[PDB]
Write an enzyme that holds these catalytic residues in place. Structure first.
Site, short mmCIF file in Angstrom:
data_model
loop_
_atom_site.label_atom_id
_atom_site.label_comp_id
_atom_site.label_asym_id
_atom_site.label_seq_id
_atom_site.Cartn_x
_atom_site.Cartn_y
_atom_site.Cartn_z
N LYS A 130 4.99 -2.51 8.63
CA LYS A 130 6.16 -1.79 8.05
C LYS A 130 7.45 -2.54 8.33
O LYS A 130 7.75 -2.77 9.53
CB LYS A 130 6.24 -0.36 8.57
CG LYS A 130 7.42 0.40 7.95
CD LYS A 130 7.31 1.89 8.05
CE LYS A 130 7.73 2.46 9.38
NZ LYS A 130 8.19 3.87 9.21
N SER B 40 8.39 0.73 3.01
CA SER B 40 8.04 -0.69 2.74
C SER B 40 6.89 -1.09 3.67
O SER B 40 7.18 -1.66 4.74
CB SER B 40 9.24 -1.59 2.90
OG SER B 40 10.34 -1.11 2.14
N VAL B 41 5.65 -0.77 3.29
CA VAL B 41 4.43 -0.98 4.14
C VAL B 41 3.36 -1.78 3.38
O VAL B 41 3.01 -1.41 2.23
CB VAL B 41 3.88 0.36 4.66
CG1 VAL B 41 2.68 0.15 5.58
CG2 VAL B 41 4.96 1.18 5.35
N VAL C 273 0.87 -1.21 0.00
CA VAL C 273 0.00 0.00 0.00
C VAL C 273 0.90 1.25 0.00
O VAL C 273 2.06 1.14 0.43
CB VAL C 273 -0.95 -0.01 1.21
CG1 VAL C 273 -2.07 -1.03 1.06
CG2 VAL C 273 -0.20 -0.23 2.52
N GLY C 274 0.38 2.38 -0.50
CA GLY C 274 1.02 3.71 -0.41
C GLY C 274 1.85 4.08 -1.63
O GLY C 274 2.29 5.24 -1.69
N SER C 275 2.09 3.13 -2.54
CA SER C 275 2.91 3.29 -3.77
C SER C 275 4.30 3.84 -3.42
O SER C 275 4.86 4.62 -4.22
CB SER C 275 2.20 4.16 -4.78
OG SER C 275 1.16 3.44 -5.43
N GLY C 276 4.84 3.45 -2.26
CA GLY C 276 6.20 3.80 -1.80
C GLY C 276 6.24 5.00 -0.86
O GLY C 276 7.31 5.22 -0.27
N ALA C 277 5.13 5.73 -0.70
CA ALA C 277 5.03 7.00 0.06
C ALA C 277 5.32 6.79 1.55
O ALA C 277 5.87 7.72 2.18
CB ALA C 277 3.67 7.62 -0.14
N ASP D 225 2.97 10.10 11.66
CA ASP D 225 4.34 10.53 11.29
C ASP D 225 5.10 10.91 12.56
O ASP D 225 5.18 12.13 12.86
CB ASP D 225 4.33 11.64 10.22
CG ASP D 225 5.70 12.11 9.75
OD1 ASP D 225 5.76 13.19 9.12
OD2 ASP D 225 6.70 11.39 10.00
O1 LIG Z 1 -3.65 4.67 8.29
C1 LIG Z 1 -2.75 5.05 7.60
C2 LIG Z 1 -3.11 5.89 6.48
C3 LIG Z 1 -4.25 6.02 5.78
C4 LIG Z 1 -4.00 7.09 4.84
C5 LIG Z 1 -2.73 7.52 5.06
O2 LIG Z 1 -2.15 6.79 6.07
N1 LIG Z 1 -1.47 4.72 7.90
C6 LIG Z 1 -0.48 4.36 6.84
C7 LIG Z 1 0.93 4.53 7.35
N2 LIG Z 1 1.14 3.55 8.47
C8 LIG Z 1 2.39 2.91 8.64
O3 LIG Z 1 3.19 2.89 7.71
C9 LIG Z 1 2.68 2.29 9.96
C10 LIG Z 1 4.08 1.78 10.29
C11 LIG Z 1 2.97 0.81 9.92
C12 LIG Z 1 -0.07 3.14 9.21
C13 LIG Z 1 -1.15 4.22 9.26
#
Ligand SMILES: O=C(c1ccco1)N1CCN(C(=O)C2CC2)CC1
Ligand SMILES: [Cl-]
Ligand SMILES: [Cl-]
Ligand SMILES: [Cl-]
Ligand SMILES: [Cl-]
Ligand SMILES: [Cl-]
EC number: 2.7.11.24
Length: 345
Positions: free
Chosen positions: A49, A33-34, A26-30, A164
């Site tokens: 992650k 590594s998640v 998920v996130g396209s790398g943003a 963050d």
């Molecule tokens: O819920 C979201 C989210 C939704 C939209 C944008 O972020 N996040 C993604 C980023 N995350 C991580 O990478 C955590 C280390 C696992 C978990 C929470």
């Protein structure tokens, strides 16, 4: 110790406990590594992650320790928390990889702000939740330093969490959202900053939810300062004394003096109580801004405010931040924090 299994995910071998199933990036790398996963113990959809190169330098080893200490501390409804942390290593001697697990929300504030019609009630409830989470973060003497719509997650019921817990010169250059929410004293290194920088950011977010438009979309640091001073006015002698940078103080004094604008004429048709709160957040002198605890008691939030359900944090020891250690000493401190983790109820 749980049983672990292996699979290749994004050029990478992942080794995770059997409880975590159906891993998919998920996130396209943003986010790094998640992956989204199904957690069979809790029934939640989670984010897993895998840290990259966690112990490659003194600087990287200390950043790994800092991230794990911050995530283990944060226990509040409006802040991301840690569901799990694991390593497949069976001893300190074979420890190399760290994996973090959190709740995964449906979308960020940018998706809703760009694509939805927001009522005054929606703005009241979203900003109330950011301030409830910030009162908790600030009570631990933590400064967020990067509040912006992409760091605020929401679910379909309009419930919100703060993300963050780095930034480079190139990342802050030109027409970029990475700089539009920053307080002027940190954007231009005016002085030792403190937690008041986060209230400037909440004002910028609130204004954008009310208008649908970025408040200070500068093309560069200097353009953005000119947009800020046209709204709030040029500094007076009291604030100029507090700019401990001589060359920054000299540049400010080269600009023609401008008065503060009428915020009712800028935010046309908004709730008068919202205009009043924006005037208290968007103050150039950081000593005179409203705090998160004071803002929760403002009449704009009368429908949501409950002083018996706005909790504060346990104390947070950040003495490690001034400590000089070797890579292996930071790696040993991180290992102890992984093996001592206790999951939430
Ligand atoms: O819920 C979201 C989210 C939704 C939209 C944008 O972020 N996040 C993604 C980023 N995350 C991580 O990478 C955590 C280390 C696992 C978990 C929470
Ligand atoms: Cl398991
Ligand atoms: Cl959470
Ligand atoms: Cl490992
Ligand atoms: Cl953003
Ligand atoms: Cl602590």
């Amino acid at each position: 110790r749980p049983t672990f299994y292996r699979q290749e995910l994004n050029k990478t071998i992942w080794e995770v406990p059997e409880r975590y199933q159906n891993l998919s990036p998920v996130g396209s790398g943003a986010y790094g590594s998640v992956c989204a996963a199904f957690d069979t113990k809790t029934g939640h959809r989670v984010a897993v992650k895998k840290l990259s190169r966690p112990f490659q330098s003194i600087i990287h080893a200390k950043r790994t320790y800092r991230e794990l200490r911050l995530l283990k501390h944060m226990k509040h409804e409006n802040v991301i928390g840690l569901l799990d942390v694991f390593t497949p290593a069976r001893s300190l001697e074979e420890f190399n990889d760290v994996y973090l697990v959190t709740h995964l929300m449906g979308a960020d504030l940018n998706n809703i702000v760009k694509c939805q019609k927001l009522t005054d009630d929606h703005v009241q409830f979203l900003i109330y939740q950011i301030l409830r989470g910030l009162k908790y973060i600030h009570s631990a003497d933590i400064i967020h330093r990067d509040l912006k719509p992409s760091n605020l997650a929401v679910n379909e019921d309009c419930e919100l969490k703060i993300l963050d817990f780095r930034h480079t010169d190139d990342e802050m250059t030109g027409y970029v959202a990475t700089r539009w929410y920053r307080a002027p004293e940190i954007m231009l290194n005016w002085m030792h900053y403190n937690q008041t920088v986060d209230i400037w950011s909440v004002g910028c977010i609130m204004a954008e939810l009310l208008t649908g438009r970025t408040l200070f979309p500068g093309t560069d640091h200097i353009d953005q300062l000119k947009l800020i001073l046209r709204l709030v006015g040029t500094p007076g002698a009291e604030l100029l004394k507090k700019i401990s940078s001589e060359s920054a103080r000299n540049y400010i004094q080269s600009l023609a003096q401008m008065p503060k604008m009428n915020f009712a004429n800028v935010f046309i048709g908004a709730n008068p109580l919202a205009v009043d709160l924006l005037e208290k957040m968007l103050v150039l002198d950081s000593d005179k801004r409203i705090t998160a605890a004071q803002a929760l008691a403002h009449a704009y939030f009368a429908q949501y405010h409950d002083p018996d359900d706005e909790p504060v944090a346990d104390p947070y020891d950040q003495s490690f931040e001034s400590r000089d250690l070797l890579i292996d000493e930071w790696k040993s401190l991180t290992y102890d924090e992984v093996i001592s983790f206790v999951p939430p109820p």
